[PDB]
DNA sequence: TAGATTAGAGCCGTCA
Ligand SMILES: NC(=O)c1ccc[n+]([C@H]2O[C@H](COP(=O)([O-])OP(=O)(O)OC[C@@H]3O[C@H](n4cnc5c(N)ncnc54)[C@@H](O)[C@H]3O)[C@H](O)[C@H]2O)c1
């Protein structure tokens with residue numbers, strides 16, 4: 001349990017979310033985001049709930 | 052395995068299928084598709100099922116209006132699901148979304164929980180996504196040679 | 203029962219050292235020869251023109267299809283073909299209000315209004331160029347339809363500025379020469395062909411079945427103008443230099459003062475391709491004559507020889523001059539006095555005014571492309587337009603006409619002349635087509651000549667082709 | 672009066 005989840009509305013708040021995710025990654029933390037780490041062709045609700 | 056299977060609704064999705072097959076073959080991936088061979092008739096099904104079940108590492112489905120609820124594509128998806136369960140590989144079918152009319156609310160049940168690659172906005176972005184996914188998942192490949200596609 | 207011979211396709215060279223006989227397929231399979239990073243565009247026009255240009259750019263980032271992919275290869279999108287970015291965010295806008303256009307396109311004298319409109323556009327372009335901090339690769343001029351409609355020479359509306367042509371495009375290109383600004387003129391109806399109609403509810407120009415061809419053409423033009431190399435020739439033999447010649451009337455002057463402009467081409471010794479105009483318009487005062495006086499012939503050939511020697515390091519081993527007219531003896535002697543010892547000079551003539559047609563007796567398709575009837579050792583008929591089996595169609599509609607090639611001066615081999623002339627039809631960068639009906643040594647010289655004749659103030663013009671096309 | 676070369680402009684079709 002060392003991942004910071006970020007919840008937002010897509011795609012209306014993408015700029016701030018991407019900025020914040022990149023900043024937190026640069027500072028050293030582990031970030032999971034709907035627009036940068038979700039896979040293509042994967043069951044996404046199940047993966048989100050698992051995360 | 053070493054081969055990439057492409058399932059599409061002939062003869063409506065021919066332009067994109069030819070484009071994608073030529074690009075992939077020019078990048079070092081062996082592609083099996085029903086448009087690359089001019090001989091048909093004998094074992095119209097056996098060879099296809101044998102190739103899916105024996106020497107296919109990736110199954111790419113061209114998800115569009117024509118390919119939804121298409122009998123041959125549905126049988127292909129059934130065989131692909133069987134092989135995917137047999138191999139214990141979670142990422143084996145990778146749908147490609149190329150049609151703007153086909154809303155995600157109206158996709159087939161066999162592919163409704165899967166993360167699909169988007170081609171609707173621009174095809175180059177879709178190709179970049181496919182290449183990055185293949186590199187990440189370690190799809191076997193040859194040194195890229197555009198002469199294969201040319202020939 | 204005479205005899206015909208066949209000449210094979212010349213082939214052209216693309217990225218990764220791969221060869222193909224089609225520019226569309228070769229570019230859509232391998233890619234161009236060099237690497238642009240992106241095209242920052244500068245758009246000038248009304249607000250509607252800017253909107254139309256943004257629409258078009260957004261359109262060609264995606265695949266575009268023709269009705270028959272076999273006849274016309276598709277367009278897989280700009281950034282997949284060319285591996286560089288040209289989108290609607292590096293755009294810079296410079297307004298031209300309708301208030302500016304209204305007060306000028308009313309003088310009822312074509313000359314003055316043409317002058318005023320050209321000034322209205324070029325003053326803004328030059329102001330943007332000299333006193334702003336951007337780096338604009340090409341300038342795209344969106345011309346409303348009315349501006350282009352009436353600025354033709356012989357078209358009527360239903361002294362200081364008289365030393366200029368009566369054409370918007372020619373004067374516009376000529377008056378921007380000393381600034382060296384690549385430019386692309388667009389009609390407003392070309393980019394948005396759907397919304398310009400007639401009294402039937404249908405487009406004036408219907409591009410519905412040929413959209414991919416239009417995208418190919420525009421993309422290739424824009425790519426070349428920004429400093430790209432789409433393709434090169436395959437097996438140009440070393441030591442040979444080609445040289446076109448074309449004469450042009452001068453019109454508004456006390457004397458016709460026929461002007462002659464050339465175009466030079468050869469192999470750069472780095473296995474590149476040097477294709478640049480060798481021009482400073484040489485003149486002939488006599489009316490109706492299309493021959494140079496000895497001094498101009500001497501100067502022209504000396505300049506061409508010096509260009510080759512500087513670009514390579516030694517004089518040509520063979521020089522071919524392609525013209526549309528015959529050469530008299532005094533002109534050729536002038537040429538020969540200023541030519542080195544170990545250099546063979548051959549003068550050729552290419553003409554279209556000769557009635558000879560061949561009909562296939564069986565089908566409904568025309569003669570093949572590589573055919574040629576060799577009348578003699580110093581003449582032959584060469585078909586450059588005809589049925590091409592690779593694309594499964596003919597480049598013309600009706601029965602095509604051949605080119606008549608004559609070795610007027612010198613001593614050479616007609617087979618080599620025909621082969622070379624056919625291979626020069628594959629370097630039309632103003633178009634994205636399978637092949638052209640004329641050698642481009644004779645077509646780009648004409649385009650240079652017809653630009654630097656709409657004015658007289660140009661001195662020592664640029665040679666690069668991207669300032670005239 | 673002819674034959675034989677030359678360059679300008681303008682207009683229309685591209686699919687099915
Ligand atoms: N920021 C958010 O709003 C956010 C965050 C996490 C999860 N979600 C979930 O809610 C979203 C709702 O999306 P919407 O319907 O409002 O708009 P939408 O589907 O048009 O756009 C949303 C995005 O579409 C993509 N997407 C949706 N279904 C997909 C599938 N089957 N395969 C591949 N990509 C798919 C995802 O990237 C998703 O974030 C998605 O279903 C899912 O990601 C949203």
Ligand SMILES: [Mg+2]
Pocket residue numbers: 423632671
């Ligand atoms: Mg042009």
